[PDB]
Symmetry: D2
């Protein structure tokens, strides 16, 4: 009930769905949280639904916006003190095969899913290192960082990139004794607001040829592995992939 005592976390894309569940459990475990999203209506409502401004605040930011990343860390420091924990969770999908992906679609997806995670990881190392915070960078990296989907070409590229870039950062932080860990989390199919707006999506995802458990997960499934990775319980885990997917990748 205080597994994140003293932690100060930034969670990108934290105003709905998976990111909001992470933020909710982080606050319940004692962390101070800054959540981001592009829309202030959603974000301010989300923060107030979780706790007081002494526990959680919202910062408007598109994770592809490099300059905004500096302002986000500045604001979080001023509200809560030194940032210890970063969850790079914001991401988008293009439902196109590699063959049918336009270059504009390619660049837009990579700006959020890859450039954004790079900007956050790079800045996080610079701001977290050598502060004795037990710092942890958690990069959201999908079953699509492991297995292809014929209709998710650019998404697959971005998730494979985050999977292995995170190992580079993990190693550099470990070898330099920075007291920063970097790991990736790989959700299978999760019942999100988006999933609920796509007719038939959940049923298709629950077929046993896709998810062997025969149903999809919920946002708290991803929140709990993120609590583990943000806490000092996982102080020896770095450079590794944590898969929570109902068996999807085991077959």
């Amino acid at each position: 009930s205080n597994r994140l005592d003293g932690k100060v976390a930034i969670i990108t894309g934290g105003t709905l769905g998976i990111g909001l569940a992470i933020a909710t459990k982080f606050v319940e475990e004692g962390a101070k949280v800054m959540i981001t999203g592009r829309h202030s209506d959603v974000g301010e409502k989300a923060a107030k639904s979780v706790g007081t401004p002494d526990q959680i605040q919202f910062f408007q930011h598109d994770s592809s916006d490099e300059d905004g990343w500096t302002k986000l860390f500045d604001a979080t420091e001023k509200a809560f003190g030194p940032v210890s924990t970063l969850v790079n969770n914001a991401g988008i999908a293009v439902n196109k095969s590699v063959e049918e992906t336009t270059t504009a679609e390619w660049r837009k997806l990579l700006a959020v899913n890859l450039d954004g995670v790079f900007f956050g990881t790079r800045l996080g190392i610079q701001r977290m290192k050598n502060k004795g915070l037990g710092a942890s960078i958690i990069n959201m990296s999908s079953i699509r960082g492991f297995v292809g989907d014929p209709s998710l070409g650019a998404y697959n590229a971005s998730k494979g990139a985050v999977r292995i870039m995170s190992k580079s950062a993990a190693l550099d932080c470990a070898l330099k004794d920075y007291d920063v860990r970097v790991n990736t989390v790989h959700p299978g199919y999760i019942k999100t607001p988006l999933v609920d707006d796509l007719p038939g999506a959940e049923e298709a995802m629950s077929q046993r040829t896709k998810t062997p458990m025969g149903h999809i997960g919920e946002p708290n499934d991803i929140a709990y592995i993120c609590v583990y990775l943000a806490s000092n319980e996982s102080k020896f885990a770095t450079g590794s992939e944590f898969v929570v997917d109902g068996g999807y990748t085991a077959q």
Copy 2:
């Protein structure tokens, strides 16, 4: 502080080192625990050091002993009620290359590390399935289930076997709606009693070409990932590998 409320766990090789830390944290999170080991002096002392017989007991058992597995589950049921959780942690190593492994060494190691995990996993599914327990089988499966060591030939064989056999069991339990999950845990180098009896072992393991963090882990590092996997927090995780290795396999 009650993340394992109501759980009933068997932990093989639970009387020292990693297994004892798992048992200790399991009891602290509300589980009832039966620990095993071959030696009753060690085992009875270990159980009493953790809690009362209402919380934790010892059962003398070599995990290669197929008939003893039945007696172990029987005893645990009689002490604590239906078993929900099994940690197959007992294991041995032969420090021989494949080239230099005698067949007697091969069969002895496989009897503990592979037959034993098979016996426990098979029996666990039979006894746990369809009871609404949120059941979880946690198979200890090493960095040596991922990367070879020239001087651990039979050990590598056994850990690779446990890694993939566990996925078969995970899938069968998921597809049949048994309410049993099966996952593997892959420690890097951990400061155990054995490590402390080998002069120079810890220093060699801490070299950056081996463990990038520059130091080895502690038994509680493995206990905490086991708490996560035994708890209902991980109810969507099955068929997956959880690596806690200080960066060993990331490079």
Copy 3:
């Protein structure tokens, strides 16, 4: 057309199906070959169908028979000179889940698929090392060395074991400059005699949720990757997995 010039190969389970195709292409690329199998009627016919006794011979041997392995290498040396190449291809399956596998089934499958590959790999290193042969041990290791099948529990165990044991042997041979490489080959579904005797098997295997190419492979698909790995073309490849599966593991 002489990619295996001067090589001397043992291929276990070489009298039908995949093993026979490997032997056929090996002979066509200039290797001398000893094929094994349990039945002399099949084996003598198979050898004569491929070439003369100066090119290929049959040796009756169950790969679980440890003492027979010595006799097999002796016979191959006497026929053809020093063995350079070993393909551990003999294997069996039990169509049982982990839950439903009897211990007799478990031990029988491991005797062929795991003990047998260990016996051949161990002996191969001892006999091949330090002879300047460009020696290569090719261990047949399945898509089931990567992904679980709920009805192939013991098979999954054996293939995971061969996958990682082979890396141990690869590393030891490389670090000791033995001039022996060890790699694994991982077929997807292949149209074998066995497949043709199971009604409906090929159609089930060709479903896109199983093999994305929509059809299964043929024995020559596995023969060609084995030629590459046995030849000096692959002199820098060791400790690695070579997957030929129509896309099975990519999704």
Copy 4:
């Protein structure tokens, strides 16, 4: 000696080192080849060193140049007929950690290593599909598509991206019966011109803690696996990773 009979191949970065060896072996196996590079002095010399214009030509092209990709395929078609084979081999490295990578460095590396491979793969599918060519796209994807290097942050990102994007493309081509395969090749350390210009690089790469064989590979090591993947010998291989690394990733 005619394993690529009738094939028409584009090899990016084909004027030196690994790419030139691929082109050389491709021509020796009967393929017609268009090699690319940025510098015409190098490229025209390279082509003429391998064969006549009826066998091999050079096309000046930076693989980050999207519009040039169309012109490259057009020119290759006019010289040799329909393209069957694409090797995306051009790539660059920044020797910076994630922490120390400037955004300009990030974008420059991704433009070549990731955008370029995407442009070539996308165009290759569009131009190769449904032509009965036995088409094959071979994406060069490094040991750094598997394991991190603390000083290769952007490179790791790009190689992880190519690793998994290639599986998406493989699956789409297989499920749509396009007669196009897509696979990745993962060299370890190879003695290239670049390696020879870095004092001490080869010795560092040959340390057993890096390459267990105790020496690095040569360009023909990568050419031979590319011949296999471009030939119809590998007609059942798609969506998979082919590692040729002297044991680097096995430990």
